[PDB]
Design a protein around this ligand. Sequence first.
Ligand SMILES: O=[N+]([O-])c1ccc(O[C@H]2O[C@H](CO)[C@H](O)[C@H](O)[C@H]2O)cc1
Ligand SMILES: O=[N+]([O-])c1ccc(O[C@H]2O[C@H](CO)[C@H](O)[C@H](O)[C@H]2O)cc1
Ligand SMILES: O=[N+]([O-])c1ccc(O[C@H]2O[C@H](CO)[C@H](O)[C@H](O)[C@H]2O)cc1
Ligand SMILES: O=[N+]([O-])c1ccc(O[C@H]2O[C@H](CO)[C@H](O)[C@H](O)[C@H]2O)cc1
Lengths: 479, 479, 479, 479
Amino acid sequence: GSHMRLNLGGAEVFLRAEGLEEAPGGVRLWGREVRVFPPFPAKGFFRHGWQSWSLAAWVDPAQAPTPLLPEARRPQADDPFLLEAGAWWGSGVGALRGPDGRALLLGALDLGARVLGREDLLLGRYAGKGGAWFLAYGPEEEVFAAYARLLPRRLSGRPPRVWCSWYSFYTRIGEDLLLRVLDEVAAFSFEVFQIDDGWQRALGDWEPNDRFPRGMAFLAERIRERGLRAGLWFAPFLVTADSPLFQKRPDWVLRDGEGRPVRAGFNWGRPLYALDAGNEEVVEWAADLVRKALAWGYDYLKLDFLYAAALPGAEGEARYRKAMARLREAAGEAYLLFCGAPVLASLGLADGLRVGPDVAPYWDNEERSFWLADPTGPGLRNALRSTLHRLWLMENVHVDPDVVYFRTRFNLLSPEEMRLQEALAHFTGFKATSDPPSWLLPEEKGRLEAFLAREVPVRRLGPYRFRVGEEEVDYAPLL
Amino acid sequence: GSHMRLNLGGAEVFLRAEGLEEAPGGVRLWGREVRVFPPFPAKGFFRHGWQSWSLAAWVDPAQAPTPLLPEARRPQADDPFLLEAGAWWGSGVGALRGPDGRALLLGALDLGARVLGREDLLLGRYAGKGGAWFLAYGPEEEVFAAYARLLPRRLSGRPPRVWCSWYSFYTRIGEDLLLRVLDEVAAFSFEVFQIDDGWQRALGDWEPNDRFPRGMAFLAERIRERGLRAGLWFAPFLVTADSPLFQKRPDWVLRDGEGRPVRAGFNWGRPLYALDAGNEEVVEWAADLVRKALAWGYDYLKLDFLYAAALPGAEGEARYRKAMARLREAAGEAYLLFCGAPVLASLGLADGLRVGPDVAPYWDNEERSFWLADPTGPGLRNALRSTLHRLWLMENVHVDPDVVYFRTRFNLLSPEEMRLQEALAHFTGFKATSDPPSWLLPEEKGRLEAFLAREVPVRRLGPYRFRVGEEEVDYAPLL
Amino acid sequence: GSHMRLNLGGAEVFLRAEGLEEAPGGVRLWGREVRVFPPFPAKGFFRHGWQSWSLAAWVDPAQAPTPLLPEARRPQADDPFLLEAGAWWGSGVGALRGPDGRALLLGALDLGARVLGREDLLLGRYAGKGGAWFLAYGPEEEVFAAYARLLPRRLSGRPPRVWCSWYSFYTRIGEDLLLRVLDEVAAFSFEVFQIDDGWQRALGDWEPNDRFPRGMAFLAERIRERGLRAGLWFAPFLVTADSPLFQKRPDWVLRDGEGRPVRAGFNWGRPLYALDAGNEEVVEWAADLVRKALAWGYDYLKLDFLYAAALPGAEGEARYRKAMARLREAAGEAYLLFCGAPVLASLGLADGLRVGPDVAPYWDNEERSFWLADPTGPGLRNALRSTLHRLWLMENVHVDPDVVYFRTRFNLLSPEEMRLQEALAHFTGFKATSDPPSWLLPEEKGRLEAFLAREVPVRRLGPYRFRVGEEEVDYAPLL
Amino acid sequence: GSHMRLNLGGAEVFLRAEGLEEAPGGVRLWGREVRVFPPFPAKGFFRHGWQSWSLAAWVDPAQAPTPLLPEARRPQADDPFLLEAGAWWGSGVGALRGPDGRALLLGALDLGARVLGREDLLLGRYAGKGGAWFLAYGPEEEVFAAYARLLPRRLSGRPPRVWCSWYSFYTRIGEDLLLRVLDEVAAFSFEVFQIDDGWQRALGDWEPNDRFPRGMAFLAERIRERGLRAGLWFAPFLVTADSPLFQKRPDWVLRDGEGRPVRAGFNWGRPLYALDAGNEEVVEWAADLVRKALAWGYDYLKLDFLYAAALPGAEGEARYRKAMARLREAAGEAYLLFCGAPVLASLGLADGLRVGPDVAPYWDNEERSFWLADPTGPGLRNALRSTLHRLWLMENVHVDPDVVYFRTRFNLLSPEEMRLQEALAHFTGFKATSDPPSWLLPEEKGRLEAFLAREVPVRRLGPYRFRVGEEEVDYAPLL
Ligand SMILES: O=[N+]([O-])c1ccc(O[C@H]2O[C@H](CO)[C@H](O)[C@H](O)[C@H]2O)cc1
Ligand SMILES: O=[N+]([O-])c1ccc(O[C@H]2O[C@H](CO)[C@H](O)[C@H](O)[C@H]2O)cc1
Ligand SMILES: O=[N+]([O-])c1ccc(O[C@H]2O[C@H](CO)[C@H](O)[C@H](O)[C@H]2O)cc1
Ligand SMILES: O=[N+]([O-])c1ccc(O[C@H]2O[C@H](CO)[C@H](O)[C@H](O)[C@H]2O)cc1
C-alpha cells in the first residue's frame, strides 16, 4: 500500500503499510503485506521458527539456508514453507540487527503471519487475511519485551515442579516400574508425577496398553495418595496408518486438495499423519480425550505434536487456535503443557510451552545436526539454542526449557553442560527432571532436592550471559 | 469476443474483437485481446522493439527467435517478455506483409500492449486492462503513416543542432577539457553544447564530481556566453549497488514481489537497478533533478535509460507515462531528448526520441551482434536498422538517429558508411555530432559546417531508398 | 577359462576356472576370474567388508545395496569399489547359503581379490594379476574354519589385557590426567596401559603436544614402574591438509593419476589424506615411528586407519602388505594391534586385529546407521554385527571385538547390552576397557576385576548362540 | 618412476622421474611423465598456450579456468585439450612462482608435451612417446633463458622491416590499390612489401583472384623494381567445405577415427577444416605452394593458421614438425614467418614467429575477451599480454609482436596505447606496420620513418618494465 516515513528509536525508518497508529514501545501497522527498511546495514536476521522444536536463532541473511534432511522429517521440524524456501523466512516475528546491538523488530499481532529477512528489508506477509503488526527500534531486549506485551497472556501462578517419565525410560514404561519409581520420587519436593509416551495402545487409541493392566485411573490415584498431582501425555491430533482410528474413520484424516493424507512427519519408525483439526467431530473426539483424562484423576496434561493440528503452517493457525480453544475449555483449570506446538499461536491458551528441541543425554548428535542439517533433533545444544531465543515469552506463558539432568549414570552430558540447562530452569521457574532417584548418586540426590526446594535468584546481564545466584553463566560459545 | 467480417483495403479480413468502428485509413477495434487473420500467406512480420535500442525490423515468422545473451543484459535491450518468449512478440504494433508488398497492421492506441506474429495471425494483447486498436491494410508507408496520426504528437518546430560529448570522450570528460572543446565547437553552426555521461558523482548522485570543480552552473554560463544553449545528460531512474542513494533510500529501489531489487541490466561493469517510478517521492525527486538542471542554466536535457522507469515491460508503461508526465512539466519548455526509452509510450511527452541503438566508431561488433545475438549493442549497422523502421514517427516527435561522424581520426567507419548516417540526419533533420574539431582534418571541418548550416531537401522513394539533395541512398544491402 | 564339473559336499557343482586340485575341506581353484554355480536357490550372500570397520553380514542378494552417505566418508568405511557398485561385492571371500543352512564359500588365498554375489552365482575377481582360490560346500562353520587354515597365522599365546584411553576421554587426554588414572588402573589385573589418540601434535607430527610436557618416554617409564607394559596409538599413513608434513613433504602424499591427493575420508572435522605406502621413503619413516616408540619404552602399538596404506582398495593390498611387513619387523616382538585395517591382508602380520566398528556408549546412532545408511559408524550394535561374522579368524590372529564397558556413568548402554559385549570378549579372549575406575560404582569395580582375572570357559553352539561359562547368549535378535 | 631428491637454486626439491642428469642452469630429467614438487607454497602458475594466438600468462592455480566460447572457435584458440580441461594445463613448459619472485620451471626438450600446474605440483606429461625435460629453480628471467638455450635456434641476422597489407585493408585488397600504396611505401625505409590475406581465390586455391588480373609474379616484380623484397601470405593447410580442393581431393582432408573431418575453427564466416599434414601427398602440394611463390618472385612468406597441420594438439606435433621441415627446405633461405603456429614445435624451422594474438585498431573487444572468455581474439591488450610472456624466445627465433600503429585515422587506439606496442617492436627488433602513408598525418609520417631508420637501445628492468631509449615503459597495469 502506502509509503510512510517514521521516527523510531531516534532513527528515520521508511516503510510500506496500509495504515499506521501509535503503540507502546513502537508503532502498530496494518496490511496483508508490510515492508520495513532498516536505516543501517543489517548484520543479523532473527529467524523465528514455527513450533517448539523449530530453530530460533540469529542468522546471516547473506548466506543461503541449508535444506533440512531427510524430506520425510520436515513436517515435524518447522513450517513446511520456511524450509522449502530459498530465502530466510520466519514465523510470526522477525528482527534485523544494527551494528550497535539494537534490533528493528517486525511482529504479527494476529495469526498466520510470516516475516522475511534480507540485509535491506523486513517483509511481513499474512498467509490468509491481513492483520496487525508491531514495529519497534531499540535495544534488543526492550523491543522483544514490548512485542510480548501486545500478545495474549496466561500466567497461572508459578510453574509446577514435575517428574517426567520420558528422559530416562522413554517408551519402555509400565505400571509396575512406575509404581516403584513413584515411591522414590515422592520423597523429593515435586508437585506433579507425569507419565509420558508409552502408556497408550496406539496413536489415536488413547487407552492403556498391556503393561498398564489396572488402567490409568488406578495409577493416578496412587500418585495422589502420595500428595502429588498426576500428569499424562497425549499426541491428540496424530495418527499412523497402523492406527485403528486411521482405518475406522478415514474421513477424520487431514487430506490435501487431491484427498491424499497430508504428511506429518516420521517417528517411531513410521510415517505420520494428522487428524483434521478443522473437522468439528475430530475436535470433539480430541476434547473428549482431555475430559477422559480429567475423569481419570489427571490435572496436568502434556499435549504433544500439536503442530499436526495446524498443518500446513501459517495457513492452518486459525483452525489450530479454534481447536485448542475447545480443548482449553474442556480442561477447565487443569495445567496444559503445549509441546511441538506453534509457538505464537499457542499464547493465551497454554499454561506452559516447550520453546525448544528435546534435551537429550548428549550434547549434539553431529550426524543429525550437521550432516542432515536438522537443528530440531534431540540434543542439549539444540535445546538451549532455541530456548535462549524464546525467553521473551515468559511474559505470556510458563516457558519450558525441558527437563534438567542431575544423574551421570545413563547420561553422556558433562557436569558443566548440565549446569547450563539447570540455570535456564531457574531463570524460567520451570523445573522438571526425568531422573529416577535410584539412578542418582548420593551427591546427586542432594543437588536435585536443593534445586527443587530453593528459589535461586537469577538475573539476565546480556543476550547470552546470566547471573544465577552469584555464579555467572555464559552461553555465547554455544552458537 | 465477437467474430467479425470486414472489407479492408479491398480484401476480406476476418477478425475477432469486442468492438469495431470506422477510422481514417482503416478501423478501430476494442478489446483486451484481439485477433486478425490475414487474407494472404504472410511472408514477413514487423517486429517492433520496446525501447530506443530494441530491434525494429521485418522478420521471418517461420524461423524461431534467437535468445539474446548474456541474460544479465536483457533488461536494457528490450521488454523482458519479448526476449523470454519463444514466439515473435512486438511492442505496441505489429504488421504482416503480403506477397504484393502491402502490410496488414495492428497497433495499440493505449499503453501496455504487445502484438504476436505468426504467418497466419496477428494477435494483440494488452498486459493491463483493455484498450483500442488500429487495424489497416494497404501500402506499407500509408498504414504506418495512418497509424502515426492517431498517436500523440509534440513537434516543436525544428530540432536543435547539438554537439554531444559522448561519442568521442565517453565518460573521460572534465571541466577543463570541455572548456577547450567549447571554444573549438563555438566556431560552428551549433545551437546546443550538451555534456553527456561523465560529469556526475554516481548514478543517483547527480552533483558534479572531482573533474568538474567549479560545478555545473559555471559550465552552463560559459556555454551561454558563446550564444549556445547548454545541454545536460541524466539517467534519472537508474542506480547501482554502490550508489549512495541505493544505501540511503533502499525504499526507493524497484522491488519484485519478494522484496528483491528488480534487475535493470549491466553497464559500466556493474549490475544495474531501478528507482521505483510508481513511488511518488521518487518521481518528485526526479522532477527536482529537472528543476535543478534548469536552475543551473540548462535548457536541453538528455534523459537516458528511461526503460528503467517502465520495468518490467508493457506492464510498466502506465507508471512510466505518469512519471514522465511530471518530468515533462518541471521542464516547462526545455527540450527533452528521450534515450533508452519506451518508444510509443513516450510520444507527446518527448521533443526528441532516440529510435535506434547507439552509433559507434565501427560498423558492427560481430561478437555482440552475431555470437551474443544482441542487435541492441552499439554499432552503426545496428543503429541504422532500427532507425529506418521507425522513421514513420517523424510526425509525432523529433526522430533522433544518433550523432553523425565526420572525423576519420579515432574512428573505424569507412567514408561510405559515414554518409549513410549523415543522410538519415538530413532526412529526420536531427543534426548532432561528437567530433572535437581539433580531431578533424580541414576537409572534414568543411563538411561538418556544410552539414549543420543549410537544410538539404530529402525524399523517401522506397522503404530503404532515399533521395537526399539528389543522392539516391539505398539501405537495402545492410539488412 | 575352462568349464569343470565337481562333487563338492555331496552335491554337483559347476564351475569355471583355469585350474583345479584337491584341498583340505574342498578344492583350490586358479584364475584371475573364476565362476561358481550353486546347486541350490541361494537365499543369502555373505558380504565380507574390506577393513575392520566395514560391514560383515549375511545379505539378501535380491534387494539392491543402499548407497552409504555422506560420500566423503566412503574411503574410511570400506573398499571404495564395494560402495560405488550397484551389485553385492565382497572383499576376499563370499559365500552363498542354501535352504539347509549350508554355505558355498569362495575365498581368495592371495592379495587383491573381490567376490561378487547373486543368488545364481559366485564370481571371484582379482584386481591385479591372478591367484588361487578355496571353494567348499558344507556346514557354515566348517567351510569358514577350513578357509581360515589356508590363510596366514600369527597367534602369539594369549592376548594381553589392556586399559585403553579412548572410550572415556577420547582426544581430551593429558599427562597429568593419565597419571591419575594410571594410579587407579594399576590396582586391577591389567597388563597393558595404552594411551590412545590424543597425545600427538598432529597427524604426521608424532611428537608429544602441549598437554604432555614431559614427553612420552617419561610416561612409559611411569607405566612400567607399576608392572605394566606401555601402549601407544598411531595412525601412521594418515595426514591432514593442515599437518606440517603435508606441507613439508608434499611428495609423500598419495596422489591419483593427475596429481590430486586421493581422499581418505573425513574425521576430526577435516578432510583426510594418505601418505603414499609405495613410497619407500614413507615406509621407512613409518618404520622409524615404530622404532622411536619402542625406544620410548612402548611394546604395545595400536596402529590405526591402516586402510590409508591400502587405498584405493583391493588394488592397494600389495603395497599395503609390504609396508606392513616392514613395520612388523621394526617392531620386533612388540604387540601390534591393527585397527581400521584391511582384514585378510593383515593376517600373519598383526598380533591383534579389530574386526568391527568402534563400540560406543550407546546401542545405535539411528541417524548414521539408518538415514545415512552407514553401518561402519561407532555403536555397540554395529560393532557386534561385524565381529560375530569374523570370529572364524580366531585361529589366525587375536580377534579384537573392541573394549568392554562396565561403567553406567557416562554411558547410555543398558546392562543387558553391556553383557553382550563382555561375552564376546570372553569368547575371543581379547580383554580391554576404557573405564576410569573412579567413574565406577563398587559393584562395577568388582565385575571388572572378575572379568580380567580368571579365564571363563566359552562355547559356540550356533552362529549367534554362545555358552560363556554357562550363560547361553543369543545374538540372533540384533541382526 | 623413481623418487629423487635434489638441490636446485639453493633449495631442496623433490621429484619423480625415470632418470636425472646435470645440465646448464638446472637439470635434465627423463620420463613420459615427471612430477616436481615446489619447496614453497606456490602463488602463480605459468600457463603457456599452444600456438601463436594462445594465452601465455601467469594465472592463479587455485581458481578454476573459464570455458572459452563459442565451442566452434576453440580449435583456433589453443590446444583443444588445454581448453576442455578442468585443471590448468599448458603446452611444452610450465612454471610455479615462489613468494620471493623466483620460478620453478619444468620444460620439455622434445615435441608433444604438456605441463600441469597445481599449487603443490608441476606435472609434465608427454602425449606420445616419452622424452627429455629441463628443470630449474631461480630468478624468473634466468630459468627461462636457461630453458631457451636448450631448444632449437634459427637466428637469420636481424629481422626485416615489413610493410604488411592486413591491418588496414584486411581482405579488401587488389592489385590496383596495392600498386598505389607501394608507391608511397617505397619512400620509407622498409625492406619487405608483404601482401596479406585477400589475394587468393579460396583456401586451397592459391591462385590470384579477380582483383589481381595480371597475376602475382607481376606484382612481385614491381615491388622489387622499387628495391623491396616481396612477401606473400598463405594458410597452406587450411580449407573450407566451399573450397574446390575440399571436394576434388576428399582424401586430403584430416579426418578423425570415424572419417569425419576434424574441426579446425570458424573464420571468414565459415567452418574451417584441415588438410592432413600426415599425408605425404598433401605435404608436397604444400611445399609446392612455397616454391610456386618463390618462382613468382617472393622471398618472404607468411605461413598462417599453421596449427591446422598439428591438430589435435600435442599428439600432432610430430606430424607438424615433419611437414614444416619439408616446407623449410623447399623455401631454401627465403624468410618464413610462422603465424598461428605451435610455438615451441616451430623453433629451428621458423625465421620469425608470431607470439601473440592479432593486434587490432582497438584495445580490447570486451564482448569477446570477457563475455566469451576468449583472450585469443584480435586486440592490442590481448596481443601484448601473450607477447610479454614469450620474449624469452628471442634466443631462438625472431619474435614477432605483430604490426605497429602510427596512424590515428581509422584506428581507435590511444597514443599511449600505441607506444606500448612500438616499444616491444624495438625490443624484439621486429618492425612492421600496415599503415598506408596517405592515412598518416605529417607528424605521423615522421614518427614512422624515425622508427624504421634508427635502432633505439632498449633494456629490460623487470618482467613488465622496460627502458626504451631513455623512456621507462611499464606494462604491469595491463594484466
Ligand atoms: O526430532 N524429532 O522429530 C522429535 C523431537 C522431539 C520428540 O519428543 C517429543 O515426544 C516425546 C514423546 O514421544 C517426549 O514427550 C518429548 O518431550 C517431546 O518433546 C520426538 C521427535
Ligand atoms: O547496453 N547497451 O546496448 C548500451 C549501453 C550504453 C548505451 O549508451 C547510452 O548511454 C550513454 C551514456 O552512458 C550515451 O548517452 C548513449 O548516447 C546512450 O544511448 C547504449 C547501449
Ligand atoms: O569414521 N568412522 O566410522 C570412525 C572414526 C573414528 C574411529 O575410531 C578409530 O580411531 C580412534 C582414535 O581417533 C580410536 O582409536 C578408535 O578405537 C578407532 O577405531 C572409528 C570409526
Ligand atoms: O581470433 N581468431 O580466431 C583470429 C585471430 C587472428 C587472425 O588473423 C590471422 O589471419 C589474418 C589474415 O586472415 C592475418 O594474417 C593476421 O596477421 C593473422 O594473425 C584471424 C582470426
